[PDB]
Design an enzyme around this catalytic site. Structure first.
Site, PDB file in Angstrom:
ATOM      1  N   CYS A 209       0.768  -1.209   0.000  1.00 24.99           N
ATOM      2  CA  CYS A 209       0.000   0.000   0.000  1.00 24.99           C
ATOM      3  C   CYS A 209       0.807   1.271   0.000  1.00 24.99           C
ATOM      4  CB  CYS A 209      -1.031   0.006   1.127  1.00 24.99           C
ATOM      5  SG  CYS A 209      -1.818  -1.552   1.543  1.00 24.99           S
TER       6      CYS A 209
ATOM      7  N   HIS B  43      -4.375   7.842   5.886  1.00 24.38           N
ATOM      8  CA  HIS B  43      -4.363   6.591   5.150  1.00 24.38           C
ATOM      9  C   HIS B  43      -5.259   5.685   5.989  1.00 24.38           C
ATOM     10  CE1 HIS B  43      -2.906   3.001   3.118  1.00 24.38           C
ATOM     11  NE2 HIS B  43      -2.515   2.483   4.268  1.00 24.38           N
TER      12      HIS B  43
ATOM     13  N   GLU C 250      -3.610   4.291  13.549  1.00 28.89           N
ATOM     14  CA  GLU C 250      -3.196   5.501  12.844  1.00 28.89           C
ATOM     15  C   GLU C 250      -3.472   6.726  13.701  1.00 28.89           C
ATOM     16  OE1 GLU C 250      -5.334   6.630   9.129  1.00 28.89           O
ATOM     17  OE2 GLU C 250      -3.418   7.518   8.520  1.00 28.89           O
TER      18      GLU C 250
ATOM     19  N   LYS D 251      -9.952   7.486   1.001  1.00 35.76           N
ATOM     20  CA  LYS D 251     -10.342   6.129   0.604  1.00 35.76           C
ATOM     21  C   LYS D 251     -11.849   5.901   0.685  1.00 35.76           C
ATOM     22  CE  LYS D 251      -6.030   3.790   1.959  1.00 35.76           C
ATOM     23  NZ  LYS D 251      -5.548   4.893   2.849  1.00 35.76           N
TER      24      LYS D 251
ATOM     25  N   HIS E 122      -9.596   1.604  -1.703  1.00 37.06           N
ATOM     26  CA  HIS E 122      -8.205   1.269  -1.454  1.00 37.06           C
ATOM     27  C   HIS E 122      -7.579   0.867  -2.784  1.00 37.06           C
ATOM     28  CE1 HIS E 122      -4.623  -0.429   0.404  1.00 37.06           C
ATOM     29  NE2 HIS E 122      -5.076  -0.088   1.597  1.00 37.06           N
TER      30      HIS E 122
END
Lengths: 415, 415
Positions: free
Chosen positions: A168, A309, A320, A339, A344
């Site tokens: 990713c 993200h 996160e 996203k 994604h």
């Protein structure tokens, strides 16, 4: 000393090019992102109504690459290669079709998966067609460096052609390497970003089963993803590709380009924790933010925006939010995880979100995170959800933390 | 002005580990090399010796990574992943099994292709065992970053896990990134190098038809590949894997480590020329040598050895000799073609030849090219053919210029 102001020269963004689930271009996509519209719909494909898996959703591209080039260019290239080629052309056009010194021009394009579906096509071919009856340069096609190699040939890029891989974070790392080389005196301009394959079954199989892709919400495509929302179940897969044109400020001015933003820092870290799961504290992830901020010559308090993200996974979004607070501390910037509105992307998602960090600076307006009602109680962040929030955005940071513990944080200053 | 002496810290090699055709370890391989022994044999296989390969010769390994790991680890890893895992362990032991700060430890393992064969295994599985009769993390296996991700997990590395993909130069680039991060201040130690799968029929098919694999001198295995010989037909394929332990000189001294040599420079370039045969003038290839030499704070005259990339093709070898002279000029160092005795590794070959540049430095001896009788008069270089040539070797450079025009030149200094 190795900082942006001091040893390193100032680098800037001069062009932009992408293709996502909302639009065929960067500009239109931005508009759609502000009108709080999602690009995820009922995933309708062959292996769909037929094959049997619990996920029937995903953001997909709104264009074909077959009617955009010659008969010969088709056969000589694979999917990713056709994609990057087209994006580079658009990008070189936005920038104003500059005539640069190719001895100082470089290319860096990464992928997270790479030419997979392509192998079943070419491997089963020899067992039917012939070994004497196939195109000579088909090897180049399934190579994980085809998209980069392809673009590196169109423009006489003679300053290096690289292909980092990182699940990713491939798209962000591609940009980090670009900024690093320039800063290091290895180049003066670079085309960077990411490119990811179409939606195959292979991954969704080994991913629905887990926990991650826990957006089994096949009834509400647009509403299925929900980054930081307490009710979040999983993430959605989305298609796309994104490329940028990075160049020193001095170089850009000598030809009068259209500077959108500036790139001032970038760090690469790893969790060395789980090969699928990110450390629940986000110690190393939060640390990559500290370095992007330092290499840029800034302070935790100068960051106004943070293009998170956040996929929408239970353990992913929590780790996160914890990493944002570890780097920032008391400061609180406006968070926005795109996203939820696109999907994604994976190999390409980091490059796409990097183009969104720029537009936020060029416009001083950030779109909403689509589906947000009750911000997870374990998550302490000011996430934009209502309406796009214009204002004064001096600096910002893009986050890309991929499966396996690959961390990348890029600092995008305003111009 | 950034150079190894001023802007950057001095970095060094502290451990070695590689598996080749001649020997199953770095040390034994070196001995066999100085004794003029080849590692090529008759390519024995059903898809080669039965089904239609004009070339029935190559250099396979001498071991299997099976009896080495657990039952659970086997099913969790693919070929490359099993290989790197084993090499890292050997490397970490040859390094005196150091105990380092994992927040400053990084990994960079490059590849050419990745786990392709892995997709035919997992994709055809869903169409038989079922979507629920496969393993969830099998994606990680066929990922082009599996070998790097795998090693980054065994040691809980937290300074970054990277996967450069540049075909033939993947192995050198892995080392270039390692040296760059340390020198940039992102780490203090790194495990770097490259890995490559087994000789498969898929590449040789889409390659033997061109004008390169012309090494169809099957009726004479060991005597076929001849780097700078006038009668050089083509290149031979060999398997292998190579890893190194690179680290700052200050760091190495603290824990009292054994230093073999020093890494002082490394550059990355591309030709943007062709997607097979490079620029017959080697302009950009010769330029990467100039940068490795400068980045190391040296002069064209300080280079005593050059572990050439020369494969043994007609247009390759010529363009390289021309690039050596472009960088150096009138000077003339002792050039060596390792592939002549071992074989083309591809992802991994650059890492293997980098380990050979070190041993030449640590021992002050250089093995001879295995097939030189009359060097092409179109090249002006001092090549070793008969007996090893020992002596005073202050500095050296390893050349890795892979198909597609990917150039990497790394500077190694004796310790």
């Amino acid at each position: 000393h190795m900082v942006t102001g001091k040893a390193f020269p100032y680098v800037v963004v001069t062009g932009i090019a992408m293709t996502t689930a909302l639009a065929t271009d960067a500009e239109t996509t931005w508009k759609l992102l502000l009108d709080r519209q999602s690009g995820i719909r009922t995933l309708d494909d062959p292996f769909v109504e037929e094959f049997d898996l619990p996920v029937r959703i995903g953001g997909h591209l709104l264009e074909e690459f077959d009617h955009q080039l010659t008969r010969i260019e088709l056969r000589r290239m694979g999917y990713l290669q056709r994609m990057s080629t087209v994006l580079s052309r658009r990008l070189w056009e936005n920038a104003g079709s500059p005539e640069v010194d190719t001895n100082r021009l470089m290319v860096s394009i990464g992928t997270g998966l790479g030419s997979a579906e392509e192998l079943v096509f070419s491997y089963d071919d020899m067992r039917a067609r012939g070994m004497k009856a196939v195109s000579p340069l088909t090897v180049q096609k399934y190579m994980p460096n085809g998209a980069a190699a392809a673009v590196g040939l169109e423009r006489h890029a003679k300053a290096g052609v690289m292909t980092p891989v990182s699940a990713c974070a491939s798209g962000a790392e591609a940009i980090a390497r670009a900024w690093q080389q320039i800063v290091l005196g290895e180049a003066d301009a670079a085309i960077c970003g990411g490119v990811e394959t179409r939606i195959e079954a292979v991954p969704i199989a080994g991913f629905a089963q887990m926990r991650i892709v826990m957006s089994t919400n096949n009834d509400d495509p647009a509403g299925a993803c929900r980054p930081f929302d307490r009710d979040r179940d999983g993430f959605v897969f989305g298609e796309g590709g994104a490329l940028l044109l990075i160049e020193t400020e001095e170089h850009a001015k000598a030809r009068g380009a259209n500077i959108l933003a500036r790139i001032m820092g970038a760090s690469i870290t790893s969790d060395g924790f789980h090969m699928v799961a990110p450390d629940p504290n986000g110690e190393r992830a939060g640390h990559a933010i500290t370095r992007a901020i330092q290499l840029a010559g800034l302070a935790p308090g100068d960051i106004d925006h943070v293009n998170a993200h956040a996929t929408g996974t239970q353990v992913g979004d929590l780790a996160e939010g914890r990493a944002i607070n570890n780097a920032l501390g008391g400061n609180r910037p406006a968070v926005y995880a795109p996203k939820s509105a696109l999907g994604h992307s994976v190999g390409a998602v980091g490059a796409v979100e990097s183009i969104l960090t720029v537009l936020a600076l060029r416009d001083q307006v950030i779109p909403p995170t689509l589906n947000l009602v009750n911000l997870d109680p374990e998550i302490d962040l000011d996430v934009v959800a209502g309406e796009p929030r214009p204002g004064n955005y001096r600096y910002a940071i893009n986050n890309s933390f991929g499966f396996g513990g690959h961390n990348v944080a890029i600092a995008f200053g305003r111009y």
